[PDB]
Structures are given as C-alpha cells and as structure tokens.
Amino acid sequence: AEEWYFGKITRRESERLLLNAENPRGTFLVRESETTKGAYCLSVSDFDNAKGLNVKHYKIRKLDSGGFYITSRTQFNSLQQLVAYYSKHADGLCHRLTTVCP
Amino acid sequence: DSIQAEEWYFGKITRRESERLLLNAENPRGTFLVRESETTKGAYCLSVSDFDNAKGLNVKHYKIRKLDSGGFYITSRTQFNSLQQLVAYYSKHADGLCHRLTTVCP
C-alpha cells in the first residue's frame, strides 16, 4: 500500500513518529482525521523561528464525486495524486512534501 | 543481550518498516515481530499480519507494557515474565489478538 499512508493513528502519534528522528523539513504522512470522520490529515514537519521544530496538520476532504482537496486551488482524483502534487508544489503548505515519515 | 539476538525481535525498526516486512505476500496471517514502540517509551509492540477480503493484507499493532514488578502484558487477562514467554503463549492462544502467532517474520 502507500508508504506514506499511516491509516488510523492519532494526531499525537503522528507527531511523535514524525519527530522521532532528525528528518528534513517537509517529512510527512497521511492519516485518518481523529476529529472529522471521512476526512484525512496530511501531517508535515517544519522549522521556523516562532515554533522551532513543529508539525502542521492539513485536513484533506473527500468530495462526494470522489476527489480530494486541502484548498480550492487544486483537487485530485486520488489521494496519491494529491501527495505526488505537493511533493513538487508547496502552494500554501508550510513546505513541499519531501521525505515519507520513516 | 539475549533479546537482541532473538529471531522474533526486530529492535528499533519503525512502525512503517514493520508493516513493509509483514505485508509481504509470502507471510501467512499471524506472521509477527516484536519491536520497541516508537510512541511510548519503555513499551514494545507486537506487530501481526492479518487478512480479510474486505481490506486485503493488513497489520495489527498491539502495545506491550512492562509492569514495574517486571512483567509484560497486552491485556488484563494474562501477564508474562518475559517477551519470550509472551510470544510462546500467544503462539498457542489468540485470546483477543487478531490471530494466534504463527510465523516469525523473516
């Protein structure tokens, strides 16, 4: 299955998996949302002055038609196409997606 | 020491890596490994391969806690003096697990 899809894990777990080792900014995973049923979460590491090393979480929603989106700028016919896209284009995410979470 | 050299212990491999190893189609369901938990310090994880046609091959991860007396448990039903003893038991009795432990992960 997708090496970046971690399934049903908690926000807190995703943060510990992502921060467990010294990973480049943009290390990520996709998981089910804890707080919104049917939705997913893209959890991405980042570093900045205000927060230091931190993890940002983006909700991915699923359209009734089947597609997925984080914003109105782009939507994707699959979840791997979303990931493939943001691996090359950050567009409003804190960083483009670089390493899959070890 | 001894735990390090056990065929069923995979040390510090990550949650994702354990699923990479266990989800290989060769492995019968009930193929397992024991590893450190990445998310609870001091805990271990029993990772077991499973299957159902409404989901395919998938992995169940059970936390193993160590009691400060020295024991290890997954549930209140049974506790164990060692991880070797825990594996031995669940190789005989599923008791709440998705499957009896059958094959040690290659």
Between CA B71 and CA A67 the distance in angstroms is 49
For A3-30, the DSSP string reads: TTEEES--HHHHHHHHHSS---TT-EEE
Q: What do you get for the CA distance between the two ends of chain B, in Å?
A: 21
Q: Burial of B62 by CB count in 10 Å (0-12 exposed, 13-18 middle, 19+ buried)?
A: middle
Nearest by Cα to A5 from A79, A64, A95, A65 = A79
Q: Is the Cβ–Cβ distance between A33 and A40 less than 8 Å?
A: yes
Nearest by Cα to A2 from A91, A95, A97 = A97
Report yes or no: B15 at the A interface, CB cutoff 8 Å: yes
Expt. technique: X-ray
Resolution (A): 2.0
Sorted by where each begins, the domain ranges of chain B are: 1-106
Between CA B66 and CA B42 the distance in angstroms is 7
SS3 B5: helix
Q: Is the Cβ–Cβ distance between A56 and A39 less than 8 Å?
A: no
Interface contacts A/B by beta carbons within 8 Å: 22
Beta bridge partners of B66: B72
Spelled out in words, what is the top-level CATH class assigned to the domain A1-102?
alpha beta
> Which two tokens mark A33?
């949302």
Between CA A74 and CA A90 the distance in angstroms is 12
Residue A22's CB: how many other CB atoms inside 10 A?
8
Report yes or no: A50 at the B interface, CB cutoff 8 Å: no
Residue B14's CB: how many other CB atoms inside 10 A?
17
- How long, in residues, is chain B? 106
A11 contacts in chain B (CB < 8 Å): none
Determine phi and psi for A91, rounding to 5 degrees: 40, 65
Report yes or no: B16 at the A interface, CB cutoff 8 Å: yes
Beta bridge partners of B44: B36, B64
Strands (E), B1-98: 32-36, 44-52, 56-66, 72-75, 78-80
Determine phi and psi for B59, rounding to 5 degrees: -120, 135
Pairing verdict, β A5-7 and A52-62: unpaired
Instruction: Search chain A and give the residue with CA nearest B38.
Output: A17
Q: From the CA of A73, how many Å to the nearest CA of chain B?
A: 31
Taking an 8 Å cut-off on Cβ atoms, the answer to whether A17 and B14 are in contact is: yes
- Of residues B23, B38, B56, nearest to A16 (C-beta): B38
CATH 3.30.505.10 correct for B1-106: yes
